[PDB]
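Lab meeting, action items carried over

1. Structure of the five-component assembly. Owner: GW. Status: complete.
Input record:
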Amino acid sequence: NAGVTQTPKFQVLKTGQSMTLQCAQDMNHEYMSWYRQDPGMGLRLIHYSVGAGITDQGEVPNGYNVSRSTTEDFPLRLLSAAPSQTSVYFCASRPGLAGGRPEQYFGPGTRLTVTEDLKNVFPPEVAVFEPSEAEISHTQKATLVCLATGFYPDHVELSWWVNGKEVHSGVSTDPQPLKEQPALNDSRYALSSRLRVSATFWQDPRNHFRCQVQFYGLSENDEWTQDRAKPVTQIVSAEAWGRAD
Amino acid sequence: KEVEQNSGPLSVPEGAIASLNCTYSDRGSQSFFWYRQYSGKSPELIMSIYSNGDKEDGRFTAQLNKASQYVSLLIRDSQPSDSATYLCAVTTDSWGKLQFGAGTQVVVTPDIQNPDPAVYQLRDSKSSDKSVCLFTDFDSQTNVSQSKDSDVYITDKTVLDMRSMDFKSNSAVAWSNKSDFACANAFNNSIIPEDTFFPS
Amino acid sequence: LGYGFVNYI
Amino acid sequence: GSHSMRYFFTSVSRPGRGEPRFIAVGYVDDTQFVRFDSDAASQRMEPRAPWIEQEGPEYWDGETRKVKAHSQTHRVDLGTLRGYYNQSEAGSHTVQRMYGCDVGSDWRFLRGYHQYAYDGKDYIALKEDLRSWTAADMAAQTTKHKWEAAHVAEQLRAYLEGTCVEWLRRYLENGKETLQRTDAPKTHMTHHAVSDHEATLRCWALSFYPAEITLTWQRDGEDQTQDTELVETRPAGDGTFQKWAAVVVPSGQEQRYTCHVQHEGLPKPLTLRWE
Amino acid sequence: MIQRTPKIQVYSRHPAENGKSNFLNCYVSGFHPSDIEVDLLKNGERIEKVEHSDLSFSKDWSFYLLYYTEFTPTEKDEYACRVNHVTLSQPKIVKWDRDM
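Predicted assembly:
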């Protein structure tokens, strides 16, 4: 009833660091697989295992390591991280010989970024922009936009908060963050969202609007010698207030 | 290329039918699947089919033709939240690898009953170090095109849904910084409609 | 062509 | 006429001597076309008819992989059944499974079937409706409930009405000269006096395909299975078959006794009284 | 469990004429369990160059197996098939009859 779970959602590594991706399953399935997904060339199979105790390689095994002591868990180990291991990693599970309908269910995935220098890690700046007076006076509706800019890696989550509570009920965020620089591969990212409200909802100064951006960055275990603040996992907000104009 | 799929992207307006195909190349194949993958998350399984003919579940229908080696998926009565990429998967047996196609990206566009294309200038409420141009309330027929110049950042177009008017509206955002930059010349390299409202 | 989904007793 | 494709699987446990014996065999009508034996050299599904060798690398790779899974389930099944009936680890037990389909002379789906035996007696079978199961006892009742909950029948149904009949048709046309032939039985008739008062008439039917044949013995129209000795139809080993029938005849009567041969190679159901 | 004794037929592929190449067949059928010993004998000696079929079974789950060897029959040479199975208190020897 929990299906395939996996851990963690996001991850940043320096070249050479080790990590292990956790993956678990609930349904007494024998066949479990690990994949990577990449923009240009689809889902690719890394390693897989058709029962407890045993495993074999897929089409891209190199640099990844795996074991399966118990039928429940299928951990994937990256012993020494390479900048080409940057990817989304999906755990997956089928009944194999065990079961019913032979459908393969996927886990929610791990997005991993591997960088040569972790001085490249940057949190976002977040700004909220107030609805133009012209829009109120043409459509009687009010668009607030949120810019989150200047961050690396592309690992964020955006949410809008009004008067205490989170709203989904009138927002459109970008599906992926933009690269600010199509030059570098360590280039920083930006993302936008829109919040639309009615003009009389905007005009009431009782109303508080807050754009929330969760960033996933360094750990507290991470060494930081820079003069800059250590770019840990953290939330940055921007806000505006209703305006009687 | 074991499983061959529909190139893409595929734009269909709301209420219409998206038909997706794929072709596989192993006659002995016995299992056929359609996955739905929203941007930034995991493939979710939506339809399994095991025999020739049609399977219907809700707004989905898969067809199988084992003679032609052809799996398809129709989506009647589209919602804008069907926008996603759709992967077909094919297998031979419980121990056979699941063969995935590349995926067809399907974009469902909103009915915008009467467009009101407009570019607004949004003032920063803090401060920050920029301002924002918002192209909004334009046509589902209209594409926004990005950067010729290096410093101008334009997002791709997305749709919001204000669930009170039932007001869908398209929007797109352009911002920049260290230049001579206003909202009049921000979508100059995009084919914007004749009657786009520019306030002064 | 054999059956692709044999299960346990 | 009708045609069928059937696959036969046999697993036998070997206490003290390691992994079970696994033997798998495929037929179309009465012609073995594929084999797997866990003790043979190759570790693959292997061709047994000329017309199936034309199938490529993918075909054999998947057949091999499938039959290795069949082997694997049956190895586990022997341990489950032994648990189910609380039997010792010292004994050698047997699992048998048989599945496939019949098609009509139009070549459309006629029947599918899937049965299972433990130590040579019925354990569980798909009913003709391809939806429900007959479980032969209280231990198999468990398996039935397990397989009903896990929708096994629906999965099988897809194969039996679908893939099974699709691949049969492909085989029937790939081996046209081989499988769509009909070889009429060469007849022969022997008589040897046993002792003075008594003689034996013996009806032969040789070189025939396929194996289904009927020979009956008869006086004046009334058929006589009170004296009849009928052997089992037996392979000649070249692809055809052989059978004989006999009676215990009081000698001097061998003109009013008739032998009745029928087979789908025969336009007319043959009579042969002794010369 | 179930125990059934094999039916044994010994016979030739073609009509037997002396001096002419042929096949001698021993077909054991109707048996259970599958563990079975089958040798083909020439003048009492075991013949080595003997093939058998892959094991299959009938509607009643009983097994059958055909064992076979390429021979040239003569007047003097005696051919038999020797079978062993748990149902048999001693192994069965079945001589080839040429009109059977």
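2. GW to write a short summary for the group page. Key points so far: The longest strand of chain B covers residues 167-176. DSSP finds no helices and 16 strands in chain B.
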